[PDB]
Amino acid sequence: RNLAALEAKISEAKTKKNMLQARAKAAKANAELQQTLGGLGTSSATSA
Amino acid sequence: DPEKVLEQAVIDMQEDLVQLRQAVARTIAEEKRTEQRLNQDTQEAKKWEDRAKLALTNGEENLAREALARKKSLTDTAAAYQTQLAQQRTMSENLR
Amino acid sequence: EDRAKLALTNGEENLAREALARKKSLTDTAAAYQTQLAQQRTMSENLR
Amino acid sequence: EDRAKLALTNGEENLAREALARKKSLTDTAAAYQTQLAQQRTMSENLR
Amino acid sequence: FERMENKVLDMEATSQAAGELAGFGIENQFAQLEASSGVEDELAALKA
Amino acid sequence: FERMENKVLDMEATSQAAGELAGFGIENQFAQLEASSGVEDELAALKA
């Protein structure tokens, strides 16, 4: 029974952590998209 | 000279649009993957429900409730992936 | 258009509209060539 | 505007207003070029 | 089979990339093509 | 997972920075764009 419980713990923790990391990476990618959209170099063209 | 600065900005715009295209493609890939995952998971629950029906045939209530636990886990994961895909769709439209 | 008439004989409306598409392309090309020939005639008279 | 008419055929009011935006941009550019050409004609006569 | 299914997942990623590519503004022109078909369809009634 | 959630919190800080950036006086011009849409919308009634 301890082995059954431990395997359940291992599987759930591993998969949950992996998916959490993947979604966090997706979120940070989206945040980088937002930064790039905000990060517009209009100043240089205006100076030219 | 303003000419050179404007030309350089125009050039940089070319890199920027390509980077945004790459980001959009990444978003498309992620939404595809999550859709596939949730779709398969939905059917896994039905398969375990079929095992539960086998249990219903004779005796093994324990097996039936185990299948129900698998179903609960799968549906929770499906709801989480549905939320994730909603976020992906929103972000993809924002990027578009 | 004769092929389109064959289609008119029985059924193949798809073939008729395909023939019509060919007709449209051909008439557009004919108008373009008419304009081109007008330009050629004008230039030829200029050169003469 | 012809694309806008295609939109007028069925539904796509969005396409029609997009075509109208293109029309607005094109006519603004045309007016700017008309002013530019007036300046060019004046300068050319001055030089002549 | 897991390696092969990872390749399958790469194919699914390609499908998602194509879907992300699915957006095209030129699609309106396709409708015009359909409108053109109507012309031939009208001619189908005309043959009567 | 706490390290990863600290990274997530950094992403949330980026979101708060974007919100602090959200203020723009140029937003009025966007409304003009919407007004421009109205023109095309009016033309939609005009097509009738």
UniProtKB/Swiss-Prot annotation, chains E, F:
<protein>
    <recommendedName>
        <fullName>Membrane-associated protein Vipp1</fullName>
    </recommendedName>
</protein>
<comment type="function">
    <text>Required for thylakoid formation.</text>
</comment>
<comment type="similarity">
    <text>Belongs to the PspA/Vipp/IM30 family.</text>
</comment>
